[PDB]
Design an enzyme around this catalytic site. Structure first.
Site, PDB file in Angstrom:
ATOM      1  N   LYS A  30       8.654  -5.068  -4.483  1.00 27.85           N
ATOM      2  CA  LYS A  30       8.024  -3.828  -4.935  1.00 27.85           C
ATOM      3  C   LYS A  30       8.963  -3.199  -5.956  1.00 27.85           C
ATOM      4  O   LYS A  30      10.118  -2.894  -5.639  1.00 27.85           O
ATOM      5  CB  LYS A  30       7.716  -2.878  -3.769  1.00 27.85           C
ATOM      6  CG  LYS A  30       6.932  -1.626  -4.156  1.00 27.85           C
ATOM      7  CD  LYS A  30       6.552  -0.854  -2.894  1.00 27.85           C
ATOM      8  CE  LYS A  30       5.507   0.190  -3.149  1.00 27.85           C
ATOM      9  NZ  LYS A  30       5.047   0.826  -1.888  1.00 27.85           N
ATOM     10  N   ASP A 114      -0.935   7.177   5.901  1.00 32.62           N
ATOM     11  CA  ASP A 114      -1.758   6.528   4.876  1.00 32.62           C
ATOM     12  C   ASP A 114      -2.425   5.236   5.399  1.00 32.62           C
ATOM     13  O   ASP A 114      -2.583   4.269   4.651  1.00 32.62           O
ATOM     14  CB  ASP A 114      -0.933   6.297   3.586  1.00 32.62           C
ATOM     15  CG  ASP A 114      -1.747   6.172   2.300  1.00 32.62           C
ATOM     16  OD1 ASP A 114      -1.240   5.558   1.340  1.00 32.62           O
ATOM     17  OD2 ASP A 114      -2.905   6.667   2.268  1.00 32.62           O
TER      18      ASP A 114
END
Ligand SMILES: C[C@H]1NCCC[C@@H]1Nc1ncc(C(N)=O)c2sc(-c3ccccc3)cc12
Length: 253
Positions: A30, A114
């Site tokens: 990432k 989330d």
């Protein structure tokens, strides 16, 4: 590492598939251009099979690199057929694994905030792993809970107390999002655009009009568990220890 291809791309940055020059080992990287500091801090605390494994991180200039276990099965999102979902035993199997991951996080006083099919990855053996801790936070310090007040998440997945209360308990918020995920897996449809009396689909659910979509596609047994999770009052909403005791949750499929 050789960056082979993009795994994901957005406003947050990107995720790349990286293959080791000598060993041929595959990892996900990432890449984020400087929040992320909190994402790294949260990742360092985690160790469980139902969470995307964190190998470490490296900062180069103002760019952060997060080395994560590569999940070749992709997003749970892509296993949900639009307006259909998936077979009931698969939905049950992914729900069990999702609950296992959430129990682990809540146990160490972490809330994800989330939970949605786009943030749930599958490995090479179809094992579910909770991903992307960029919105995650600590809600318990030493047997002592704090109330949260942040407007995190995507409206179809968020619990109704986020729109109503000044502050609220962390754990019922993650429980609600897991219920929405379960609805999506079983019927391939989000039940309401907003969790508010102003949204007709939300009012219809509270009025028990289950002859309507997506509820008409769901069997009575998982529907009964959904009726316990998708409860407006967070104090009356089912806790995870009681979800573990539900008839459908414990039904061999
Ligand atoms: C989960 C998504 N949540 C929103 C932000 C982007 C994020 N995307 C990814 N993040 C990390 C990894 C990883 N740790 O392996 C992977 S793997 C993958 C994949 C594998 C196969 C096919 C298709 C996709 C996507 C992906």
């Amino acid at each position: 590492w050789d960056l082979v291809q993009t795994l994901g791309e957005g406003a947050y940055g990107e995720v790349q598939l990286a293959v080791n020059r000598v060993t041929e080992e595959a990892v996900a990287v990432k890449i984020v251009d400087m929040n992320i500091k909190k994402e790294i801090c949260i990742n360092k605390m985690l160790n469980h099979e139902n969470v995307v494994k964190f190998y470490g991180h490296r900062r180069e200039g103002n760019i952060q690199y997060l080395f994560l276990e590569y999940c070749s099965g992709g997003e749970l999102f892509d296993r949900i057929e639009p307006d259909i979902g998936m077979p009931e035993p698969d939905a049950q199997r992914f729900f069990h694994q999702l609950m296992a991951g959430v129990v682990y996080l809540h146990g160490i006083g972490i809330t994800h905030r989330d939970i949605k099919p786009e943030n749930l990855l599958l490995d090479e053996r179809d094992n579910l792993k909770i991903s992307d801790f960029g919105l995650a936070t600590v809600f318990r310090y030493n047997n002592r809970e704090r109330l949260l007040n942040k407007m995190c998440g995507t409206l179809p997945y968020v619990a109704p107390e986020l729109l109503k209360r000044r502050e609220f308990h962390a754990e019922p918020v993650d429980v609600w999002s897991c219920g929405i995920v379960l609805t999506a897996m079983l019927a391939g449809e989000l039940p309401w655009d907003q969790p508010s009396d102003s949204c007709q689909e939300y009012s219809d659910w509270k009025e028990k009009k289950t002859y309507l979509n997506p509820w008409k596609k769901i069997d009575s047994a998982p529907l009964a568990l959904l009726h316990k999770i998708l409860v407006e009052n967070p104090s009356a909403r089912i806790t995870i220890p009681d979800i573990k005791k539900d008839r459908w949750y414990n039904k061999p499929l």
